[PDB]
Amino acid sequence: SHMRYSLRQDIAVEPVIAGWYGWSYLLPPQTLARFVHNRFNRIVESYLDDPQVHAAAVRQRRMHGGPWIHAHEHRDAIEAWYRETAPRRERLDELFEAVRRLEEDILPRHHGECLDPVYQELPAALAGRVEVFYGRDNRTADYRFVEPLMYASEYYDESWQQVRFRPVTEDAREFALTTPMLEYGPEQLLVNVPLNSPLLDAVFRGGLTGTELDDLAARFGLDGERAARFASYFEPTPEEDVLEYVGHACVFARHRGTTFLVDPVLSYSGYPGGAENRFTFADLPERIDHLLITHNHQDHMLFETLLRIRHRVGRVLVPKSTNASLVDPGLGGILRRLGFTDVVEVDDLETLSCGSAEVVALPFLGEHGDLRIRSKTGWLIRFGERSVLFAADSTNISPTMYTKVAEVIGPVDTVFIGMESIGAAASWIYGPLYGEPLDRRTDQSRRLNGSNFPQAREIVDALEPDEVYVYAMGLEPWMGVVMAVDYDESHPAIVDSDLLVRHVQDKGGTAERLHLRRTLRL
Amino acid sequence: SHMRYSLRQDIAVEPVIAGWYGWSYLLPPQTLARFVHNRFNRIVESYLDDPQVHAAAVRQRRMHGGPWIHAHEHRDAIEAWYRETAPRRERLDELFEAVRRLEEDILPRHHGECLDPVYQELPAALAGRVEVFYGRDNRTADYRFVEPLMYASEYYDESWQQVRFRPVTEDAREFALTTPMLEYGPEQLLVNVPLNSPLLDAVFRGGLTGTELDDLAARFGLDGERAARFASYFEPTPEEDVLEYVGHACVFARHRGTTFLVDPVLSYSGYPGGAENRFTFADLPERIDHLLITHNHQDHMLFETLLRIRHRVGRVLVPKSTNASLVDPGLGGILRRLGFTDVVEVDDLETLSCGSAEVVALPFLGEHGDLRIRSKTGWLIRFGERSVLFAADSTNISPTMYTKVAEVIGPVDTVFIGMESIGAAASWIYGPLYGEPLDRRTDQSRRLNGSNFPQAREIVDALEPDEVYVYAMGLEPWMGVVMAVDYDESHPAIVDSDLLVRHVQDKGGTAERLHLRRTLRL
Ligand SMILES: [Fe+3]
Ligand SMILES: [Fe+3]
Ligand SMILES: [Fe+3]
Ligand SMILES: [Fe+3]
Ligand SMILES: [K+]
Ligand SMILES: [K+]
Ligand SMILES: [K+]
Ligand SMILES: [K+]
Ligand SMILES: [O]
Ligand SMILES: [O]
């Protein structure tokens, strides 16, 4: 009888952890502690020291992605925020100092003898919460986190999580990763709530009466005009095979009524001036049966997108890892703290049935800065007699691997492969996680590259697909949230993608660099 | 209408890989290669050089478990066997040499720079089949195996697998791990067949007509008297809650019609003179819904037992690891090559529903020679409102871990804990897997100990069970297959187990070192 309301398509709900745009490595506390200390505090202090440097940096597109505050006009509120959160920072530096002590002062004292004494000397922040052992040489001690006891600790604190609602008025997004997530304008609403909260599911599922929205707003502890603003984000609430390239590395599929979404990133709608025919949140089906993530890079598992869709998701598939290290924290446990309750980790070449499809994980090597990170896979999906490979940014640095893989998995019809063949220094993503820096020129040799032409070619030659699509190029303007979009057919990447398309056509098959949305047969 | 036959209860079917009694570390080829080279070849050559040393060693019980051939009388056949398998050995040393080359000559050349060149230089045995990366210091290169491509390689060879049938005429078993598995007597039958073969399931399931046994025997490539001997191993084929300690660390449970078996080791029957009231293969239910293995030690996952029961098993639970190293090869993949088709790996404090029970994995630290081995867990089973902890040989070397664990899991009613508080040097299990030995006195500090009294006490104090049972003591005589059974209440272990039982009673609860079979309430 009563009117029902749902979240507007043009309102974004941005994830925030400890004051910053939320992504994987900010959830576990030991990795948060490293980022806060080695990066975020340095960004605030630098900024507070001379806001004009940042202002001046932000003024040039080519500096976008550096350690700059973009809301540089808001010095007072940023300072007030930094000042207020100083106790969060001191609690968290306890953990930072504990890991330093373990790595620098405790582990190096031992040289092959029983490691029992170490446990007796642990800092309290880590007592009961780590395991130590020797590496392959039997003499150099190392450790790993007992991940769930870390999340149970005082240092993982849900009260430091928030979302920020705001309108979306264009396709393009400003780089967000280095700016505190404050209520910078009155169109914005910053709300304290855990990212896993069923309250956010209520929000995204919608279909609420007006008095139900008020109840919800009260459960968020909103009153007054803030509740009114909240209410204003809502509006009256308005079957066979598909293969839909939606953007970057994100692909949607349907097969005999089972739905799939790989490497999810979606754009918004309801505002004038954006590009036509984009696949947005409004275009999603009711249920996403299988959500597949290839690896733990920002551009392939976007928190903002994951939360907006959580309520529709059945099962999440992801790469398996037990490293339980600062460079390679447990991905399934991250997704579970985001509130995904049915997450399955898949090892190399394991197979899982999904609806009428079969999924197989494929070895993914490279693009991780030669770090010890196990959390990465390609996904092969067999949809009946048609098989599709999502390779994401996986490389072909290991000659023959794909030949050996083909011998086991058989033929593949279609391949999606990414060709960001020149990428970031591995330290611009991972550097705050190091114990210390590498010498600058050495570091510079460690980069996050996808396949170049030759590599991509050998992949194709080895698997013999009829269709090849290059993808994951960070061209869509909404990807700017997380990376520096700036195209031009000089860029070696574009050249190489072209060479590859060439190559595949010459050999008598279809190929194309996908750029915006594309329907495909399957 | 026709008579049906089943395998006798007093015929053992012993697993064999590459001529040796089969256990986990002989299945993956890279680990097999290390054992063949660093141990098994040395045992044969030593023996062939002076059979009397071994004869003389074997004559003394206290030397049992050392590197001795027990079938020392059979020099000719052993030599003939060694001679014939020499090509298996040369193929496998190719792999051994490849890993040496990778570890000693390739990885150490690099010091922080991109590792791409390494892939170009790999020995052919490892091309396409490893991933290299840096450790935590960013400068010391390391690697891991791409496990499934190793099993696809020529170096994993099912044709080198066999079983050996033989009568069991007493409770006690001779130590088997260091004697080639040859047809030493006419009561014995050695048959070439993969350990995963459905042929063995046919054997163990039984219910075959006499002409069906002949078909089976033909499928094993048996004829003549060997087929007749095979036939002779068969004989005419002859509902609510339980908790049954069956032996060593092995426990059986039923709960609302769901069946469970932890750390499976069973004894045989059908021969006179054995102990009364043992729980043997004949005592198993039709289906084992859930098979749980705490860790990858010989005494907790006995191939011989696992194969005899495979056909009855639903699902196997095991600890999760991605290390994919020689010290810590993938356990789920080992079980899958044994032919278990539904294996699930569980991380620390993850929960899984099993029938009407819930299972939770618990952190297991220690007893692994401070090696980097992730493949180990305790299992908590919640059977309705009653909860049982199987700790196996897990220790309490990390003070507070159990307190922190209790905070998450809540109360536990019953605990099984193992108190082999003085155990083997870690090198007597793992030493052939090392790249090189440790200095002798250092090595001697690395041992495989379970909890002693104080440790075991703090575990109990932290979890507050009403019932405590010490278990995993290697007392049952059939455990001699795999360890040196030799009891006496001097042994510090027995003292400490006693102290613990004491402690628990004093605090007003039940406790006992279980010794042979015991029914229990649940
Ligand atoms: Fe990536
Ligand atoms: Fe990417
Ligand atoms: Fe053990
Ligand atoms: Fe044991
Ligand atoms: K917490
Ligand atoms: K299929
Ligand atoms: K093979
Ligand atoms: K229960
Ligand atoms: O990525
Ligand atoms: O063990």
Side-chain angles (χ1 to χ4, degrees):
Chain A
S1 198
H2 279 55
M3 217 149 152
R4 304 188 91 97
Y5 300 94
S6 289
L7 186 71
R8 290 164 43 197
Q9 292 294 346
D10 68 314
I11 293 311
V13 186
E14 294 190 73
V16 178
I17 314 196
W20 307 86
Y21 190 89
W23 54 295
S24 304
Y25 280 83
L26 310 184
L27 260 192
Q30 56 277 17
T31 60
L32 182 61
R34 284 266 168 122
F35 278 93
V36 163
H37 196 107
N38 295 328
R39 170 162 300 161
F40 292 128
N41 293 351
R42 294 180 192 159
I43 286 167
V44 180
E45 282 152 23
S46 162
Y47 171 81
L48 291 190
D49 253 69
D50 186 14
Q52 254 305 140
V53 183
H54 295 260
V58 181
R59 209 166 292 123
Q60 305 144 77
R61 209 203 308 177
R62 67 144 198 103
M63 286 216 224
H64 273 199
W68 317 119
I69 298 191
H70 279 57
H72 44 261
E73 305 88 343
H74 295 255
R75 209 260 180 215
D76 281 358
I78 296 180
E79 154 155 10
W81 159 79
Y82 203 70
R83 248 178 22 259
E84 298 172 303
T85 46
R88 287 154 182 213
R89 293 198 311 289
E90 95 213 3
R91 195 159 69 165
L92 200 49
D93 249 2
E94 209 166 82
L95 178 59
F96 183 88
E97 160 58 14
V99 173
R100 190 209 51 76
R101 175 155 181 252
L102 181 51
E103 294 176 348
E104 284 181 1
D105 308 352
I106 302 179
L107 297 180
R109 288 171 195 152
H110 303 272
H111 307 279
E113 75 281 7
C114 189
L115 288 165
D116 290 6
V118 171
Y119 294 95
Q120 304 298 322
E121 295 194 84
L122 284 171
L126 306 175
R129 305 178 163 132
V130 295
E131 178 196 13
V132 306
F133 39 69
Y134 289 110
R136 182 165 54 78
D137 77 4
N138 272 308
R139 295 174 173 293
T140 309
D142 200 5
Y143 71 103
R144 59 108 175 174
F145 290 99
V146 186
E147 295 188 314
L149 291 187
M150 294 300 303
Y151 283 130
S153 83
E154 70 187 278
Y155 303 106
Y156 173 77
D157 190 341
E158 307 195 315
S159 85
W160 313 342
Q161 290 165 27
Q162 311 164 303
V163 296
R164 204 234 257 152
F165 295 84
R166 47 161 275 211
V168 183
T169 62
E170 43 162 348
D171 283 358
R173 289 279 294 271
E174 200 183 30
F175 177 79
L177 298 182
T178 61
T179 308
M181 298 283 294
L182 297 171
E183 207 167 284
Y184 287 122
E187 70 296 20
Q188 292 183 349
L189 191 71
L190 185 60
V191 170
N192 293 317
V193 69
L195 298 188
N196 73 355
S197 167
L199 304 185
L200 300 161
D201 285 344
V203 166
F204 295 120
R205 172 171 24 252
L208 302 154
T209 67
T211 47
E212 277 166 354
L213 277 185
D214 281 331
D215 293 330
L216 188 42
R219 280 195 299 273
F220 288 115
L222 287 160
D223 208 334
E225 201 280 320
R226 284 173 48 81
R229 196 150 31 169
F230 178 76
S232 77
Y233 292 129
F234 298 82
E235 70 184 355
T237 298
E239 232 210 64
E240 35 80 73
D241 295 5
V242 199
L243 183 64
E244 210 75 65
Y245 167 76
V246 356
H248 195 50
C250 175
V251 173
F252 180 74
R254 191 187 304 109
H255 180 62
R256 302 181 135 61
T258 305
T259 60
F260 300 84
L261 189 61
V262 189
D263 285 353
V265 41
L266 282 297
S267 61
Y268 296 90
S269 52
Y271 57 80
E276 216 81 49
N277 203 53
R278 294 137 59 219
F279 189 116
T280 94
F281 292 102
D283 297 307
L284 288 163
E286 195 93 287
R287 292 291 297 176
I288 298 150
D289 296 302
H290 299 286
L291 179 63
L292 284 78
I293 294 162
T294 57
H295 69 296
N296 189 8
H297 281 161
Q298 330 175 303
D299 60 316
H300 307 250
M301 50 167 292
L302 258 183
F303 274 29
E304 183 177 316
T305 292
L306 290 166
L307 299 182
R308 178 179 285 247
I309 75 176
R310 184 172 59 194
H311 76 273
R312 307 155 101 86
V313 178
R315 194 219 235 160
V316 192
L317 302 185
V318 286
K320 195 192 183 200
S321 183
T322 53
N323 289 317
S325 65
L326 301 171
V327 301
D328 186 30
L331 204 43
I334 280 167
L335 293 171
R336 288 186 233 105
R337 289 295 156 159
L338 273 187
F340 290 87
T341 54
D342 177 25
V343 183
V344 175
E345 307 205 0
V346 178
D347 205 10
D348 301 344
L349 300 183
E350 280 178 2
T351 297
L352 202 51
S353 44
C354 296
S356 302
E358 254 192 351
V359 175
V360 185
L362 310 191
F364 179 146
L365 268 48
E367 196 234 356
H368 286 65
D370 296 318
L371 301 175
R372 195 195 268 114
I373 299 185
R374 191 10 186 91
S375 292
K376 63 188 185 315
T377 197
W379 291 120
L380 180 65
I381 314 186
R382 298 202 187 102
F383 297 107
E385 229 81 60
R386 281 261 314 166
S387 74
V388 186
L389 174 51
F390 304 97
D393 320 314
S394 89
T395 75
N396 187 55
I397 59 182
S398 176
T400 78
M401 179 179 75
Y402 276 97
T403 304
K404 289 176 174 83
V405 161
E407 291 166 7
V408 178
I409 70 166
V412 334
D413 309 314
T414 307
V415 172
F416 294 82
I417 169 97
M419 297 203 54
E420 176 74 333
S421 48
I422 165 75
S427 41
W428 186 253
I429 305 197
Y430 301 105
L433 297 165
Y434 304 171
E436 58 291 317
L438 284 167
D439 69 274
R440 292 189 193 83
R441 183 57 183 84
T442 299
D443 191 285
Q444 169 199 316
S445 78
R446 298 255 226 121
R447 307 208 74 76
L448 308 182
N449 311 131
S451 291
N452 63 22
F453 166 56
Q455 282 163 320
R457 188 189 58 217
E458 286 302 279
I459 292 177
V460 161
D461 296 343
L463 302 175
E464 305 174 318
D466 305 321
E467 308 182 52
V468 172
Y469 299 106
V470 358
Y471 84 151
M473 302 289 278
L475 295 173
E476 295 83 355
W478 49 95
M479 295 307 309
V481 183
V482 122
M483 64 196 314
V485 175
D486 259 357
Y487 98 91
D488 77 296
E489 312 104 47
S490 297
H491 203 105
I494 314 301
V495 181
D496 287 24
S497 21
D498 287 331
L499 302 198
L500 178 83
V501 167
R502 245 275 67 88
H503 169 109
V504 173
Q505 287 154 341
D506 292 350
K507 299 236 171 150
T510 325
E512 177 177 8
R513 165 154 30 74
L514 304 186
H515 164 236
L516 262 138
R517 200 271 190 67
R518 283 294 308 283
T519 314
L520 290 166
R521 217 199 292 156
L522 184 67
Chain B
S1 198
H2 279 55
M3 217 149 152
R4 304 188 91 97
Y5 300 94
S6 289
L7 186 71
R8 290 164 43 197
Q9 292 294 346
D10 68 314
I11 293 311
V13 186
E14 294 190 73
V16 178
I17 314 196
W20 307 86
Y21 190 89
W23 54 295
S24 304
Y25 280 83
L26 310 184
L27 260 192
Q30 56 277 17
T31 60
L32 182 61
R34 284 266 168 122
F35 278 93
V36 163
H37 196 107
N38 295 328
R39 170 162 300 161
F40 292 128
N41 293 351
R42 294 180 192 159
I43 286 167
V44 180
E45 282 152 23
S46 162
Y47 171 81
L48 291 190
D49 253 69
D50 186 14
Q52 254 305 140
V53 183
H54 295 260
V58 181
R59 209 166 292 123
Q60 305 144 77
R61 209 203 308 177
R62 67 144 198 103
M63 286 216 224
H64 273 199
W68 317 119
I69 298 191
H70 279 57
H72 44 261
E73 305 88 343
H74 295 255
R75 209 260 180 215
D76 281 358
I78 296 180
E79 154 155 10
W81 159 79
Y82 203 70
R83 248 178 22 259
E84 298 172 303
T85 46
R88 287 154 182 213
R89 293 198 311 289
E90 95 213 3
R91 195 159 69 165
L92 200 49
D93 249 2
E94 209 166 82
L95 178 59
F96 183 88
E97 160 58 14
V99 173
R100 190 209 51 76
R101 175 155 181 252
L102 181 51
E103 294 176 348
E104 284 181 1
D105 308 352
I106 302 179
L107 297 180
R109 288 171 195 152
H110 303 272
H111 307 279
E113 75 281 7
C114 189
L115 288 165
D116 290 6
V118 171
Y119 294 95
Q120 304 298 322
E121 295 194 84
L122 284 171
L126 306 175
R129 305 178 163 132
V130 295
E131 178 196 13
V132 306
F133 39 69
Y134 289 110
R136 182 165 54 78
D137 77 4
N138 272 308
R139 295 174 173 293
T140 309
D142 200 5
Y143 71 103
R144 59 108 175 174
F145 290 99
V146 186
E147 295 188 314
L149 291 187
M150 294 300 303
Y151 283 130
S153 83
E154 70 187 278
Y155 303 106
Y156 173 77
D157 190 341
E158 307 195 315
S159 85
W160 313 342
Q161 290 165 27
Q162 311 164 303
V163 296
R164 204 234 257 152
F165 295 84
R166 47 161 275 211
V168 183
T169 62
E170 43 162 348
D171 283 358
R173 289 279 294 271
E174 200 183 30
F175 177 79
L177 298 182
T178 61
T179 308
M181 298 283 294
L182 297 171
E183 207 167 284
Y184 287 122
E187 70 296 20
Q188 292 183 349
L189 191 71
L190 185 60
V191 170
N192 293 317
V193 69
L195 298 188
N196 73 355
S197 167
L199 304 185
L200 300 161
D201 285 344
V203 166
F204 295 120
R205 172 171 24 252
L208 302 154
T209 67
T211 47
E212 277 166 354
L213 277 185
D214 281 331
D215 293 330
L216 188 42
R219 280 195 299 273
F220 288 115
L222 287 160
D223 208 334
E225 201 280 320
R226 284 173 48 81
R229 196 150 31 169
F230 178 76
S232 77
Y233 292 129
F234 298 82
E235 70 184 355
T237 298
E239 232 210 64
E240 35 80 73
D241 295 5
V242 199
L243 183 64
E244 210 75 65
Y245 167 76
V246 356
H248 195 50
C250 175
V251 173
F252 180 74
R254 191 187 304 109
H255 180 62
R256 302 181 135 61
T258 305
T259 60
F260 300 84
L261 189 61
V262 189
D263 285 353
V265 41
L266 282 297
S267 61
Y268 296 90
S269 52
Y271 57 80
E276 216 81 49
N277 203 53
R278 294 137 59 219
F279 189 116
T280 94
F281 292 102
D283 297 307
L284 288 163
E286 195 93 287
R287 292 291 297 176
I288 298 150
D289 296 302
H290 299 286
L291 179 63
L292 284 78
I293 294 162
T294 57
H295 69 296
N296 189 8
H297 281 161
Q298 330 175 303
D299 60 316
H300 307 250
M301 50 167 292
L302 258 183
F303 274 29
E304 183 177 316
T305 292
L306 290 166
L307 299 182
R308 178 179 285 247
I309 75 176
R310 184 172 59 194
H311 76 273
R312 307 155 101 86
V313 178
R315 194 219 235 160
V316 192
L317 302 185
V318 286
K320 195 192 183 200
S321 183
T322 53
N323 289 317
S325 65
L326 301 171
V327 301
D328 186 30
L331 204 43
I334 280 167
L335 293 171
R336 288 186 233 105
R337 289 295 156 159
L338 273 187
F340 290 87
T341 54
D342 177 25
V343 183
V344 175
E345 307 205 0
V346 178
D347 205 10
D348 301 344
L349 300 183
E350 280 178 2
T351 297
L352 202 51
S353 44
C354 296
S356 302
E358 254 192 351
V359 175
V360 185
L362 310 191
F364 179 146
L365 268 48
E367 196 234 356
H368 286 65
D370 296 318
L371 301 175
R372 195 195 268 114
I373 299 185
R374 191 10 186 91
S375 292
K376 63 188 185 315
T377 197
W379 291 120
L380 180 65
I381 314 186
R382 298 202 187 102
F383 297 107
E385 229 81 60
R386 281 261 314 166
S387 74
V388 186
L389 174 51
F390 304 97
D393 320 314
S394 89
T395 75
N396 187 55
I397 59 182
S398 176
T400 78
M401 179 179 75
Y402 276 97
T403 304
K404 289 176 174 83
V405 161
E407 291 166 7
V408 178
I409 70 166
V412 334
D413 309 314
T414 307
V415 172
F416 294 82
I417 169 97
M419 297 203 54
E420 176 74 333
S421 48
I422 165 75
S427 41
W428 186 253
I429 305 197
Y430 301 105
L433 297 165
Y434 304 171
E436 58 291 317
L438 284 167
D439 69 274
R440 292 189 193 83
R441 183 57 183 84
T442 299
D443 191 285
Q444 169 199 316
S445 78
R446 298 255 226 121
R447 307 208 74 76
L448 308 182
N449 311 131
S451 291
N452 63 22
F453 166 56
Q455 282 163 320
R457 188 189 58 217
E458 286 302 279
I459 292 177
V460 161
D461 296 343
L463 302 175
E464 305 174 318
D466 305 321
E467 308 182 52
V468 172
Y469 299 106
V470 358
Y471 84 151
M473 302 289 278
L475 295 173
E476 295 83 355
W478 49 95
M479 295 307 309
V481 183
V482 122
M483 64 196 314
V485 175
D486 259 357
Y487 98 91
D488 77 296
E489 312 104 47
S490 297
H491 203 105
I494 314 301
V495 181
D496 287 24
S497 21
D498 287 331
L499 302 198
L500 178 83
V501 167
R502 245 275 67 88
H503 169 109
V504 173
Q505 287 154 341
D506 292 350
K507 299 236 171 150
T510 325
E512 177 177 8
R513 165 154 30 74
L514 304 186
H515 164 236
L516 262 138
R517 200 271 190 67
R518 283 294 308 283
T519 314
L520 290 166
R521 217 199 292 156
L522 184 67

